[PDB]
Amino acid sequence: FKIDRSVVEEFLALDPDAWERLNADYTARRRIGEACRALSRHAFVEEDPSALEELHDVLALIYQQDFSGAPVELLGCETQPVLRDIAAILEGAVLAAELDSISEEQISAYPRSGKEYVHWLKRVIGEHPAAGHPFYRDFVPTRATEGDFRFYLAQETNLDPKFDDILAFMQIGAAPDEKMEIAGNYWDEMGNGKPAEVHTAMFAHALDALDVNDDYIRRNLLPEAKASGNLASCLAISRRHYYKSVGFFGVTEYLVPRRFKLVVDRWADIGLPREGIAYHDAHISIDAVHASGWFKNVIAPAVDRDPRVGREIAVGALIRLNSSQRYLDSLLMHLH
Amino acid sequence: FKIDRSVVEEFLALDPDAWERLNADYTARRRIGEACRALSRHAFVEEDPSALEELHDVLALIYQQDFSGAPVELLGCETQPVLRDIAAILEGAVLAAELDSISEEQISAYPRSGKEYVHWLKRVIGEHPAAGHPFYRDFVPTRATEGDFRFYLAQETNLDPKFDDILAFMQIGAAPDEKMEIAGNYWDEMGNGKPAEVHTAMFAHALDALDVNDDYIRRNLLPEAKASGNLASCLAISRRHYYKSVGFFGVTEYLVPRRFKLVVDRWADIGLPREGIAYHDAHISIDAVHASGWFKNVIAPAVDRDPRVGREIAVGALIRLNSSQRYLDSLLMHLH
Ligand SMILES: [Fe+3]
Ligand SMILES: [Fe+3]
Ligand SMILES: [Fe+3]
Ligand SMILES: [Fe+3]
């Protein structure tokens, strides 16, 4: 038995009683799981490109269930026993591959107090090539066209359109000072109560301005863009990945202002309609404040409360930097 | 093989490799699951009281993992394949028992438009005895002492201390108008950014004023109080339970002001320190506004977008009313 996206699409078409029958059959469930381990070996041991993309298509389908409002026809379907087993196996493989690129020395050299840890992490981030990647630093200001921006935006639907729920997942069970800061960030994502300022709505207008429609996305989303979006989902939805998540989305806010300023300046230079980039324009100043509060009010208190979590936050940071590097190199490659 | 709380506590003590070994063994996992079906039969077919309380002790332990910040020693432990199978089986049994008390006529008679649906639901709520239960209506104003309030508050640690995360889970994937209202409710739960006004912090002070400490809670929490708290967890954490959740927490906000006004007035009459009930005092006016916005901005738009969800919201409402009735009758019974 083999597992792929269409197989999981078929599961998701089952009726509630068919789901109850599948859930009761630990023989069909063992087979599903062994099929997942086989797909994982192909993707990461053999590094078969089509298997890796199939694995991320499967994860993306599952996370779509975790993050999306359920449709009426599905409300009775108990999908957790099977879909969580699939996710745990493929996730476990995605994350072991990320950690194979991370050395013990990178994540153990840190000062064991909050304010000091922040200086260290910013230096560590600044040393990584993704922090000044040529896609933003060289390609965008000198070459990017409408069609380049359209292709680029298609890749970015993996992350920005779900920041609000990533934050809502992350703050579950968080210590009070960390929860307060994440809460305020979430409330900003929701326009501080004003629908016209909701960040995902403003991001949808950028997609509108360039016709980044659902066919274009599905046809053009790169495998590294899928992995990026799946990594963010994976880390946000498990409580045990919280500290990795703190590092991952901490790096995310920190890099936005430099990246978006290069994007908006070129967008104007090539005459594109400026209300199209209200999202990126706004985030230049918003995420300067988000990044500052994230370091000072999430990362520093976590390290001060238990310095052992500094290692988890560093891992999460490096997972974001490495995956962003692979995604940006792949993007720049396709754009040349 | 039998399953109970201590068995699941032992799972949660396993190291990451022991978890990986358990997850790979679909024979041990089939046994765990059959042990869950057996516990479920005892709890709900035989209605053995100790089995029902054991089932809710197991669920409460699992939800504690879902809602609580993970400890450092546990960050590497892949608990989802087993704990989600346990939860799906015991949850499925808890919810079938709730639905056995709900007739098709109760949840199908509703008008298929939003504003009309709200009037109907309020009438349906007002017809249920939990909406004017003698614990609040008769016992509290005439008899409640310090020790009664202490016992009562111990039961209420099942729900109020996690409203913020219940709301954060619920709004995942919600349609925009519904998400905005849930978001604003969450931001109120977080003191609108002011730590002294965070609702769970103010609720902790009420517990402090009466010495509702962790031993007292563990020794005194009633089985119906556990079921109440597990029902709220169950509905909030699955996307497919969203509309039931909307009905369940809609009833919750709606009933708070009448209930809390009876509590605070007696609290003052018996001379208890009034800063102890800052939480309940505040919520008399806050949840009047929360309930109004929940009907107008969550329930009415959901029904107008797809009237089929009116049946789910009604189920969730009746699940809250029925479970509250059983919990309040059990409480009043123990207090006499
Ligand atoms: Fe944003
Ligand atoms: Fe931000
Ligand atoms: Fe509240
Ligand atoms: Fe409220």
PDB file of C-alpha atoms in Angstrom, chain B residues 1 3-15 19 54 57-58 60-62 64-65 74 79 83 86:
ATOM      1  CA  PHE B   1      -5.139  -4.719  29.510  1.00  0.00           C
ATOM      2  CA  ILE B   3      -6.618   1.826  31.003  1.00  0.00           C
ATOM      3  CA  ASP B   4      -6.970   4.434  33.753  1.00  0.00           C
ATOM      4  CA  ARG B   5      -5.379   7.722  34.823  1.00  0.00           C
ATOM      5  CA  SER B   6      -2.232   6.174  36.330  1.00  0.00           C
ATOM      6  CA  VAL B   7      -1.641   4.206  33.128  1.00  0.00           C
ATOM      7  CA  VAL B   8      -1.684   7.429  31.110  1.00  0.00           C
ATOM      8  CA  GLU B   9       0.537   9.108  33.713  1.00  0.00           C
ATOM      9  CA  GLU B  10       3.043   6.337  33.024  1.00  0.00           C
ATOM     10  CA  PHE B  11       2.914   7.017  29.281  1.00  0.00           C
ATOM     11  CA  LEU B  12       3.618  10.678  30.001  1.00  0.00           C
ATOM     12  CA  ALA B  13       6.763   9.649  31.922  1.00  0.00           C
ATOM     13  CA  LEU B  14       8.233   7.804  28.924  1.00  0.00           C
ATOM     14  CA  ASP B  15      11.309   9.251  27.228  1.00  0.00           C
ATOM     15  CA  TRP B  19       7.436   7.078  22.762  1.00  0.00           C
ATOM     16  CA  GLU B  54     -11.927   7.371  35.623  1.00  0.00           C
ATOM     17  CA  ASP B  57      -9.778  11.751  34.832  1.00  0.00           C
ATOM     18  CA  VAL B  58      -8.076  10.330  31.725  1.00  0.00           C
ATOM     19  CA  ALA B  60      -8.659  15.724  31.842  1.00  0.00           C
ATOM     20  CA  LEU B  61      -5.032  14.543  31.866  1.00  0.00           C
ATOM     21  CA  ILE B  62      -4.900  14.533  28.062  1.00  0.00           C
ATOM     22  CA  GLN B  64      -4.016  19.224  30.302  1.00  0.00           C
ATOM     23  CA  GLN B  65      -1.356  18.348  27.701  1.00  0.00           C
ATOM     24  CA  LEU B  74       8.753  16.525  27.468  1.00  0.00           C
ATOM     25  CA  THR B  79       2.451  11.988  22.259  1.00  0.00           C
ATOM     26  CA  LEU B  83      -3.161  10.407  23.142  1.00  0.00           C
ATOM     27  CA  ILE B  86      -7.457   7.707  23.481  1.00  0.00           C
TER      28      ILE B  86
END
